């Protein structure tokens, strides 16, 4: 609360005094918290007075902070220039005070390495992180960034090694423990991740840690995703997750993720209207949680609001993922299938298969959409020969896929008995396809019968023309 | 000096849903208890 009064006093001072570098810097140091543009403007103003009246080069700290603000904004090029200038300035004026400037350069160097990570120069970032760690083995963040980069590469053992190395320096480091727990949970190792996050809650300084409690409740949330016959076990897990989320909401009333967790549990409980209300509230609060968009789209589908669901899925996919996430793509395909746009559903499932051709569920879904499209065309008695032949070819493809999937498939996701029955239905549809193709051929000969009559009449018109000509 | 942390990243800027969400949860619990 006092930071706003300090801002007001400093703003009042700056307006009264156009030339006060310290007031501008003081104002900037509090605008950083919530006003990136305002802090940037204040730092720029301070730099202008330093160059104009003072006629001195900017301090490295101001350049580092300007670069960090640009990094927060997204101007990576300006951030790189400012970080390099800050390193250069700290080096240049190191003789005046080597001890202080060495530490300033250490922080600026870490910033530049983080930027290189942002610019996808992971080799330079890794080399810089290692250079920092070589001289300052107690910089935990460098260990964690190397582990994060290793995890981003996909080398989870290397990531865990870097994370363990960070824990070596700082035995109780909540971020390092969170990173190790996240690694374990991402691998679906529930016990290890649970222990790593409960360890944090065992510590006195983090007795009630919102991040750790949310992860612990998310562990019980993930158990509802897989259907289970045991009703009591599922219901108790729902209650456990809800209790953790409620406690986090009590401790923090602005927690978006506690609210989203409550909505997800409510939706898994079947209360789609209440979950929609929670999601809409959370959605008003922010638009930068992709799970909120996906949960809202799921509720739309459950409420038969297919127009909104398809747009939400497509928009979420476009905004939150640079690559293709086959799970969201499958969600979009299901939404289109419910809406009845089978051609768009087929195209979406083919797009999924393009990226994940080994997915057996995608193959089963493609076969189902092909059978439905072919059956719809065959039932239509106004279809021409070309469409009927294409439907016949598509029925054959579906029959082959269903038989192959029945021979080998992923039993944990879909039952092969259903695939076998689908294969039989495709075979029966093909058996009737002979009559259908005969029907189409007779239809298109009648098409040419009328065409001749059209030509016949036009010739009579020409005959009148000759009568006119003569 | 860093501003964004693992606790403030889970928080909304200002909006509070504690009252509305707990009211909604009370109604769900009330309806659940009423049914038998």
């Amino acid at each position: 609360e006092k930071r706003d009064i300090a801002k007001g006093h400093l703003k009042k001072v700056t307006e009264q005094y156009p030339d006060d570098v310290e007031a501008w810097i003081e104002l900037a140091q509090i605008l950083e918290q919530t006003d990136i543009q305002g802090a940037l403007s204040a730092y720029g103003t301070a730099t202008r007075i330093l160059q104009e009246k003072v006629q001195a080069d900017v301090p490295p700290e101001i350049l580092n902070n300007v670069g960090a603000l640009h990094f927060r904004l997204g101007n990576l090029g300006e951030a790189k220039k400012y970080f390099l200038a800050s390193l250069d300035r700290a080096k240049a004026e190191a003789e005046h005070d080597e001890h202080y400037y060495n530490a300033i350069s250490v922080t600026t160097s870490y910033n530049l390495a983080r930027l290189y990570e942002a610019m996808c120069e992971f080799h330079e970032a890794e080399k810089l992180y290692k250079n920092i760690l070589r001289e300052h083995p107690n910089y935990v963040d460098c260990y964690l960034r190397l582990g994060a980069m290793a995890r981003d590469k996909g080398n989870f053992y290397e990531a865990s090694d870097w994370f363990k190395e960070a824990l070596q320096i700082n035995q109780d480091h909540p971020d390092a423990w969170s990173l190790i727990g996240n690694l374990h949970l991402a691998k679906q190792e529930w016990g290890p991740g649970q222990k790593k996050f409960e360890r944090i809650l065992k510590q006195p300084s983090t007795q009630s840690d919102t991040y750790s409690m949310l992860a612990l409740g998310n562990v019980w949330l993930q158990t509802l995703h897989q259907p289970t016959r045991d009703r009591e076990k599922e219901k108790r897990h729902q209650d456990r997750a809800l209790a953790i989320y409620k406690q986090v909401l009590r401790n923090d009333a602005k927690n978006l993720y506690a609210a989203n967790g409550i909505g997800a549990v409510l939706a898994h409980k079947g209360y789609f209207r209440e979950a929609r209300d929670v999601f809409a509230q959370v959605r008003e609060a922010t638009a930068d949680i992709s799970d909120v968009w996906l949960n809202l789209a799921h509720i739309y589908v459950e409420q038969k609001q297919y127009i909104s669901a398809v747009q939400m899925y497509e928009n979420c996919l476009r905004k939150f993922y640079k690559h293709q996430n086959t799970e969201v793509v499958l969600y979009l395909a299901r939404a289109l299938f419910k809406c009845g746009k089978l051609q768009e559903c087929k195209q979406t499932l083919l797009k999924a298969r393009h990226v994940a051709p080994s997915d057996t569920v995608l193959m089963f879904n493609v076969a189902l959409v092909l059978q439905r499209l072919a059956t719809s065309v065959l039932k239509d008695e106004k279809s021409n020969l070309k469409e009927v032949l294409n439907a016949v070819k598509e029925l054959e493809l579906a029959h082959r896929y269903f038989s192959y999937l029945s021979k080998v498939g992923d039993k944990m996701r879909f039952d092969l008995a259903l695939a076998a029955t689908e294969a039989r239905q495709c075979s029966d549809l093909l058996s009737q396809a002979q009559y259908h193709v005969a029907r189409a051929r007779k239809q298109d000969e009648e098409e040419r019968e009328l065409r001749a009559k059209q030509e016949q009449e036009k010739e009579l018109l020409r005959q009148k023309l000759l009568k006119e000509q003569e | 000096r860093v501003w964004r942390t693992r606790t403030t990243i889970l928080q909304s800027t200002g909006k509070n849903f504690s009252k509305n969400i707990f009211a909604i949860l009370q109604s769900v619990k009330a309806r659940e208890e009423g049914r038998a």
Partner: peptide
Amino acid sequence: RSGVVCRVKYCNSLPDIPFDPKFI
């Protein structure tokens, strides 16, 4: 009783630990 095979999951995935540039 036939439809697209897709299990709808209501997910609440926490964000990654922030590592923004540090201010001096």
